[PDB]
Paper text:
The structure of ligand-free FnNanA was refined to 2.32 Å resolution. The structure has 0.35% Ramachandran outliers. The conserved Ser79 residue is in the disallowed region of the Ramachandran plot in each monomer of ligand-free FnNanA. However, electron density is well defined for Ser79. All four subunits in ligand-free FnNanA are structurally similar, and superpose with a root-mean-square deviation (r.m.s.d.) of between 0.127 and 0.169 Å for 290 Cα atoms. All four crystallographically independent monomers are very similar. Small-angle X-ray scattering data of the soluble protein also concurred that the protein was a tetramer (data not shown).
Residue numbers in the entry:
A (entry chain A), D (entry chain A): 0 to 289
B (entry chain B), C (entry chain B): -1 to 137, 138A, 139 to 289
The structure:
């Protein structure tokens, strides 16, 4: 029921570093109305979201839920810092109406798997909400074993997993071992291969600007029209190759400003986008998205 | 363009004393051609324990293979591995024997820069006059070549394709669009369905010695946009591969080939002999997936 | 130049409810200063589970540490981790409290290029006016900085040194010769003797909470060219460290500190509690190596 | 008794690719007389030695043993290809008089440890010679565990190990667990740190041209004169930094030609050394070695 394309909301910032509330609402509206996404992924690692305070993470969650209402599905990423920040955020967004959570493991310590399980099971026990897990524990690089997925999926309110690494063998194994769980692709350049292996959705940050093509790839592949889907994936990956060449986070923001959305400013010590990269973003915009 | 299809990576059987079992070799070729109905044979690949044999034992394998297969199937001769002079000597031997396509891994004895890899491949093409399939990863470096590096190699018209060994589907898709006129072979059997929908022209694998039927079906069904049926067969194939890998891939394939009446030969020291527990597991996999 | 010597990486003790155990914190400081006779304390480091605490809990730790240590030892305040605004806010807080040296890991939320790392460090130096020790590896990248990148950072005169976390002794030797006027700290206790003979000015480690005596001896004996005696103590130190690592380093250090009368506090969820088997093993190591 | 500095002999080649016999003798003489090395390491991975035939590997071993006689220790590396080539080479060099062997594991297969042990134990059983093992199985990157060293060192004719990776923690552990075995450093840039941890010798290819400084570092460190040894190591590493900057294999050969030794030609497809790199090798020669 949570299927479809999700855009990873990137939070825009004012000149002074605070959150640009009206700019945040404009990005939500652009994703819902123009990109016609099936959901929003709020609080993800995308861009520079993990640096903001707990207080500012809570204001972003409330602004998002009040502007999106339920035109779309919403998932709240509440992990990363530690387990009690995850629980406080998890019960705040549960009280705001967020019907699903996700959590990356904490960054301050390399936890064994038995502590990953306690971490995830505690967020489900203390919030009562649904949970999406990550196939890779935060900053470890190693995918979880298929046996470890089974131990986590024994909990019924852990309803899915977001794949960040493009291991399609493990993806296929998880897909067959757990036909009742949701699997989200977290790689936009390989959406077509993921869709034919039966993923239920995709979460990406390019879908802020390329959501239309992604919904077509997702829909055409689930109806076995591979010839047309591969051709759109070829065009999508020419956009992504240019965006990556040009700096992905800043190119997406610069393209959003070319579409009439105030995507805000960057926070130090990140270097400002150059004139050559602004002109290159406009060439990408006119070639692929206008 | 005629070299599309599923290829089996021939594994060389050995006698008790370590020499090659010529009649076991002929029976494996017949099994792949008649029962597996493969579209071609990949001879001389790194698969199993083939890189340990002498160049002269390599010449006898190439001659036995072309003489047992006739022209029922495509043949690709892997002539690299050791050095450039053995690659050229092997490359001209198998070209005179009738092989119409070559492949070559870079030599193992040195970490060559790209400008010396290109001279390596271009020299084998000039001295044999044969077609060439390159590897996306230089031997024992782990890093895929850049898309610009593919362009410099693909400037040669007798470098007709590339065998992908790492499952980087982003790079696979980029190479596919940048060079629509070149052949691309998947070298990963567990991900055949994803590679096929991105437009690979064939697959070279060692599981096709025993699972060639399912692989041909996945390849044909996916190229005809019937993903639902193709995904179910890929699921069954990966249940076999997961068991084969759990049990030791090289030895399980050999023991399964012996359960169907093919003399797969013996192992060479210092490789350990397969256990009774693994023979029984190979038999369960055989009865469950292939009988 | 006055900040040479052995430094202990303070591990913050926690109460049963997760808040910081202030009196346990004072007792750990006293144990390091009086019994271990360390030359300084490294406060706020990634060691153990310190990066999980709030900035406000970080401010109370910095204030407790400077007030318990007075000026018996050098103090370095690690103010990085979260972002640049917390680093600058922390950096000016501990500068007003009397800390004479800072260190900062790069932020964790983004993979910064080098030109943004340099702005990061130069901004903390300009906004606090304090001295700065950099890390040879940007937080969560794994790759050491280039020797040219060290030169661009060391152009700032208030960047007085570098803490090496990876044991690359070739790069350590190159940095040592290229910048004889800068401080270099080893951050690997198992290789103290090799780092000292290459001219490191000190060591920052977490084993020095309990093995500071042996580490000071290795440091002093090696800088006075008595390698034979220094190697024997390094052998004993590494027998302790091998046991500590086998048993879980963070929890074994805490349990050993409790065997000598220091309230090392409790663990925070989701970390698992130490077993009886590991408590008994910590006691054997204590009786064998430190009593 | 095998202590000291060993030079890794690099085989010079004629214009046609064959072995330059008189050039090989000249390199042996330069290492024995001018570099005053304590031994020669023949057949190692250095340069481009692993490509030559078994026949040409046998001629190199005999030329080396007949020109060096016993002015120096000799170790013969007989592994890499497969186990029966290792045994044939091992008994040939045992019949030539080589009193110690070494062997890297085969390249054609990723052997488990129980097959590494059978591999090494077979070369010792079939030749009766002494054996030096490598801490890293050929092309795997992973050091052996200290428990695995113990299982191998249970054989008394496996007398030592050559360390290729600079893990000084593992080096110190192996040194203490087996005080009766030889340990050779295989990293010239870190000779001083290795010497203070009690290594019995060093095997390197820079010792073809920098053997004098290396013997001084080795001798000064074993007599606790660290101040003088570190200063020579600083100078040695300035040479090595330049050699590496310039291409190590070709710079060493070009420096040997600047010292009056016919170090031969390169084999295709290796690119020939440039004029800028020849001039740079001469600057290194005049600055560090003349």
């Amino acid at each position: 029921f949570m299927k479809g394309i999700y855009s990873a909301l990137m939070v825009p910032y004012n000149e002074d570093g605070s959150i640009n509330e009206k700019g945040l609402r404009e990005i939500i509206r652009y994703n819902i109305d123009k990109m016609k996404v099936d959901g929003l992924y709020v609080g993800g690692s995308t861009g520079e979201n993990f640096m903001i305070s707990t207080e500012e993470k809570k204001r972003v969650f409330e602004i998002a839920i009040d502007e999106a209402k339920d035109s779309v599905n919403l998932i709240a990423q509440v992990g990363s810092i530690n387990l009690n920040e995850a629980v406080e955020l998890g019960k705040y967004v549960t009280k705001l109406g967020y019907k699903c959570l996700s959590a990356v493991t904490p960054f301050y310590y390399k936890f064994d798997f038995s502590e990953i399980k306690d971490y995830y099971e505690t967020i489900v026990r203390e919030t009562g909400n649904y949970m999406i897990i990550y196939s890779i524990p935060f900053l470890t690089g190693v995918n979880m074993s298929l046996s470890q997925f089974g131990e986590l999926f024994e909990n019924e309110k852990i309803i899915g997993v977001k794949f960040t690494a493009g291991d399609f063998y493990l993806l296929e194994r998880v897909r067959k071992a757990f036909p009742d769980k949701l699997i989200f692709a977290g790689f936009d350049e390989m959406l077509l291969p993921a869709t034919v292996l039966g993923v239920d959705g995709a979460i990406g940050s390019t879908y802020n600007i390329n959501g239309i093509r992604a919904k077509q790839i997702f829909e055409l592949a689930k109806n076995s029209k591979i010839d047309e889907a591969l051709k759109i994936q070829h065009t999508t990956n020419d956009l992504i190759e240019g965006i990556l060449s040009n700096g992905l986070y800043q190119t997406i923001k610069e393209i959003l400003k070319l579409e009439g959305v105030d995507a805000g400013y960057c926070r130090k010590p990140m270097k400002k986008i150059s004139q050559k990269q602004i002109e290159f973003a406009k060439e990408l915009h006119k070639k692929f998205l206008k």
